[PDB]
């Protein structure tokens, strides 16, 4: 059964990448929150996939 | 009670005590020759583990008591306790998972000079 996570890469980087996060207000809030919490991974761009 | 000069102990052996105890019952109190023959014959994992421990116990007794041969020795006592457990996962339908315990046993054998 084709299911929930057909894994593209251009979709991954475009929709959830660091530049897509910085591109708007809420994404920058996301980045600040994750920095404050001290996450080891900020965005999907830490998975080097292009 | 133990003459710990004459004994062997095997800790964390890869079998379940529930499966090793019957084989121990069949050789408790027998002569060494008869017990060794039984353990060699019977094709059970517990049988092989007991064979190693019993042979080691007899070896220790012989080494510390040079005038004791293979045919004055009888298996005086035999104890089989339970040892560490490891849990691994067996996945089933509908996302249900079950934990699948693996048991080990301790084995203690003491031999003694026959009547």
């Amino acid at each position: 059964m084709k299911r929930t996570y057909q894994p593209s890469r251009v979709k991954r980087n475009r929709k959830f990448g660091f530049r897509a996060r910085m591109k708007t207000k809420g994404g920058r809030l996301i980045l600040s929150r994750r920095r404050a919490k001290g996450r080891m991974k900020l965005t999907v761009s830490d998975e080097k996939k292009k | 009670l133990v003459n710990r000069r004459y004994t062997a102990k095997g800790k964390n052996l890869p079998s379940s005590p529930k499966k090793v105890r019957p084989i121990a019952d069949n050789i408790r109190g027998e002569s060494y020759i008869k017990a060794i023959a039984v353990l060699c014959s019977m094709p059970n994992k517990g049988a092989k583990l007991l064979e190693k421990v019993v042979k080691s116990a007899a070896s220790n007794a012989m080494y510390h008591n040079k005038n004791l041969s293979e045919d004055m020795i009888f298996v005086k006592t035999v104890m089989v306790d339970d040892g560490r457990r490891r849990k691994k996962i067996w996945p089933r339908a509908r996302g249900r998972a079950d934990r699948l315990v693996n048991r080990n046993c301790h084995i203690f054998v003491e031999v003694d000079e026959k009547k």
């Binding site: - | 529930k18 019957p22 019952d25 069949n26 008869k34 023959a37 014959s41 019977m42 059970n44």
Partner: protein, 59 residues
């Protein structure tokens, strides 16, 4: 199809002791080497059986 009450240790012990019971194999000392071998089987230690070689026992 599920146990209604946990059984007593007596019942569990009884069932376990009766079922998990293995029987000794019969024996008969080899005519050649004197080992105690399973009756009606080739000797595993010397290979003979009724004074006939059948195996070639290695290590």
């Amino acid at each position: 199809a599920v146990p209604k009450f946990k059984p007593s240790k007596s019942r569990s012990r009884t069932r376990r002791s009766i079922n998990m019971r293995k029987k000794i194999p019969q024996f008969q000392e080899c005519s050649n080497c004197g080992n105690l071998g399973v009756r009606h089987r080739i000797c595993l230690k010397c290979g003979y059986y009724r004074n006939n070689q059948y195996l070639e026992i290695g290590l």
